[PDB]
């Protein structure tokens, strides 16, 4: 009979599955879609109370402030190992993965409608006080770890041992201080109150975040599977995965949970991620003399000689002779190249 | 001299749900209009759309809510016909939800301040409905696959509600072992189930949450809004089964009684879905009908596990083509999976 | 051998947090099954006992 | 099989550093990016 119209050519799914699926030898124009999540690291004050913090210390002195480790929300971070694009390119070309498109979402937003759960009674015969207060929703997707900046308040706070902090803070550390650069290289260590992502150094990641701080503000959360964030820059490239690794970071403080006794503690939710990848032809920016210099420096013996480089060097004169010239009248002449051209002092 | 009238797509038949079973042309557009009543708990027969009054300070150890208090998801299924007549092997011809146009019915009912609301101050009127609210809808060709995230995993739920099974402290956050579909009305409470951000490949769910102790419900009401259900490939939710699935959950705020006992308020939600006929590759050919026939006539074997977490298949080498002989039989694929990086 | 070693959340192994990986290669006529399920009976359901 | 394309032409980075790059003489069609802060 009458045949239907030909269906539109969609991309062909090869294999769906878990993380073991990435190993498939595909072609050049393959695209993968990694779907994952991150759990919030809110402090977890005992084994029964995951996702909350410990209760807040109310009024510490500004000089003798010493918080504890269980009441500090920290950043979440993770590395997704990607397989190598083992190819046979010419003239110093490669292939790397490119984070083209992220599609994120907070998992568990309607759980905040639980009002019969030890929350503070809202009025005389009311229900429970819902979760509200200062909230912070952050996510960062890139091919390198999240390079961040240590900016805090009250540099005289005595942090505990588990949390990694800005090293030797001064009064300058209560505003921008260039000495407090660090990476995000550890889950559940870097607290949110000390570490903002570095606006000067995240050349390979794409970090997005918003903050709203009040005594009682509404946590407004949208949930949708059609929103889509493009991770491309002005040149049309995304986060390139230098080492075959995809770095995913997040921080989702949703508000303060007020207990029945009137004692507040934080609340965090998970964060879905969906990164769309592809294979980018790049060039090798580095010469072959970086491969061979690393091979030699781990097979040749380390010699503790006399210093032949530095401020106490023992090499006195080096002269480079290339090409022929007419005989100059000054043998004790001095010759070099200043900025671009050959110069000749005396 | 005036011109001819413009070409408008010709209406054929208007009516109820029985218009669906009419066999039409292949280039036919169907606009189904329906609604969903809120399953807010309904504490007795004379009070619909409310919930029961809220319990206040049940601690985490001993927390047992009641059945009529928890607002649950609304869902329904719209029976669509089957469209092929002969085999026509290769391509098939399914429905496709192109455009939803939704709306909450009854938003000006919240102007009723002479009802059982609490007196707002010394001689004022009633206190309006405000507080935590959540407006949600989903349109797809599958039931709304959803993820179980709650707080207070030691909550003892009633028997009427279906909840995430065997919760741990990991269930107070994202736990992968709480997958379920939305195939039952008034049993999946909203405080336990968010729609699954990974597994809904055939629905289009839309939702806004707005917490807070007293925030205004802001509800627009318009018949010129239009939501496009197409993905980045240009296809809407295909109806695999001969059915269209419609889900919603409308919480509009807390109704404060004269005694002070707060209780929820929900409203209905309009749906206007455009359906066209799209030609797809047949997911159920003769070979599927063959293999499903021999499936049902084969003896069930309860043997040792060969799939899942406790699986006993160790290694599968799938290999098809030919290859020049490698210099590495166990060729490494990840340069560094576990991490032999610096510092 | 020069990248910073992060110690993050388990994105590999038994306790992995990657939920799903799709891999696409070429073009295909539009399937009528958007969750392209392969096993006609993976669990063993709808077999005769 | 199928070979991947050539890489995309991006603007060539020349020199990266602190304040001392704001002394270097550059070309006519040179595009600098000054990154700074104010306390
Ligand atoms: Ca920079
Ligand atoms: Ca998915």
Residue numbers in the entry:
A (entry chain 2): 14 to 359
B (entry chain 3): 16 to 358
C (entry chain 6): 311 to 359
D (entry chain 1): 14 to 52
Q: What did the article's authors report about this structure?
A:
BK polyomavirus (BKV) is an opportunistic pathogen that causes severe diseases in the immunosuppressed (Bennett et al., 2012). Each of the six distinct conformations of VP1 present within the asymmetric unit of the capsid shares a common core fold, which is the β sandwich, “jelly roll” fold, characteristic of many viral capsid proteins. Together, these form a T = 7d lattice, with a C-terminal arm from each VP1 making interactions with neighboring pentons to stabilize the capsid shell.
Owing to the low concentration of our virus samples and low affinity of polyomavirus:receptor interactions (∼1–5 mM) (Neu et al., 2008, Stehle and Harrison, 1996), to study the BKV:GT1b structure we implemented an on-grid soaking protocol, where a 20 mM solution of the oligosaccharide portion of GT1b was applied to the carbon-immobilized virions for 30 s prior to blotting and plunge freezing. GT1b is a branched oligosaccharide, described previously as having “left” and “right” arms (Neu et al., 2013a). This revealed bridges of density between Asp59 and Lys83 of VP1 and the GT1b density, consistent with previous mutagenesis data of these residues (D59Y and K83A), which resulted in significantly reduced BKV spread in cell culture (Neu et al., 2013a). Low-resolution EM density and MD suggest a likely mechanism of binding for the left arm of GT1b, in which multiple, weak interactions occur with the VP1 surface.
